[PDB]
Design a protein around this ligand. Sequence first.
Ligand SMILES: Nc1ccn([C@@H]2O[C@H](COP(=O)(O)OP(=O)(O)OP(=O)(O)O)[C@@H](O)[C@H]2O)c(=O)n1
Ligand SMILES: [Br-]
Ligand SMILES: [Br-]
Ligand SMILES: [Mg+2]
Length: 272
Amino acid sequence: MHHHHHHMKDFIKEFLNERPEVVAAFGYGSGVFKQLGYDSKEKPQIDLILIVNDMKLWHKENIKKNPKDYSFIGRNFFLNSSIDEIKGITGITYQSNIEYKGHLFKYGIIEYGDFVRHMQTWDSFYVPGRFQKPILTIKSNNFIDELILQNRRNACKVGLLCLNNKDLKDLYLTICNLSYSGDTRMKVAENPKKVENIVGASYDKFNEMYNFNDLYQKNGERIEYEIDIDELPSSLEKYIKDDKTKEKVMEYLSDLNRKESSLQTMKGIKTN
Ligand SMILES: Nc1ccn([C@@H]2O[C@H](COP(=O)(O)OP(=O)(O)OP(=O)(O)O)[C@@H](O)[C@H]2O)c(=O)n1
Ligand SMILES: [Br-]
Ligand SMILES: [Br-]
Ligand SMILES: [Mg+2]
């Protein structure tokens, strides 16, 4: 009689319905999927990721329909600066603390093509890492769903490679951690607790997401697998060709997580 995901999806569609159309749309994060370790009563932001055809024109059209989605700085940023500066290295731009119906929304915009390239090749890891956690689908298609699956499969290969103990919960934690290693906006103390608080409260969703019995098999709480990383996304595979170990894979990923979270936090003031 109550399906959380139908009720959230409807509310989010209301928000999007005042905004220029998108190719696909997804909810994620603590405003969409519960997390342990929040004090009740904390009203976290509803985090969304929207895929568009043309970054410049989606924003231009939304600056006329919803000008209050943007600071003064930010409108000039989106209308004046080069597309290369706007996309930056992650390809995604964030509007935060957007108020709608007693809630706060924070959405990111990414062009279709940058989404495809990043998901397939991991030349950037910022967005593909977020798609390794629970995703509420609002609007998608077969092709994008298959991108999402391959990205999880390759995350799972990397997870199995890094794992020391053959324990299921720790595979889920290792996977969920890939995009958090090296993140510059997470205080040191809370970094391990954030990952635990996500997996702890969405264990079911993780069960569905990483249900790949050709890579590893579940026996209660432990798993059996043989390491297989022979096909990985092209930029990480290129990076590791002479040193295919867990250490070099984590080197690549956390280097990207450090550089990208830092650039993403700078771009965020230029666009509020
Ligand atoms: N380095 C990071 C940071 C975040 N994410 C994912 O993307 C969402 C990021 O939303 P964010 O608002 O940063 O984290 P929240 O979990 O929503 O915490 P908060 O209440 O502070 O918004 C997270 O849920 C997490 O799954 C990630 O995978 N890698
Ligand atoms: Br568009
Ligand atoms: Br960037
Ligand atoms: Mg959030």
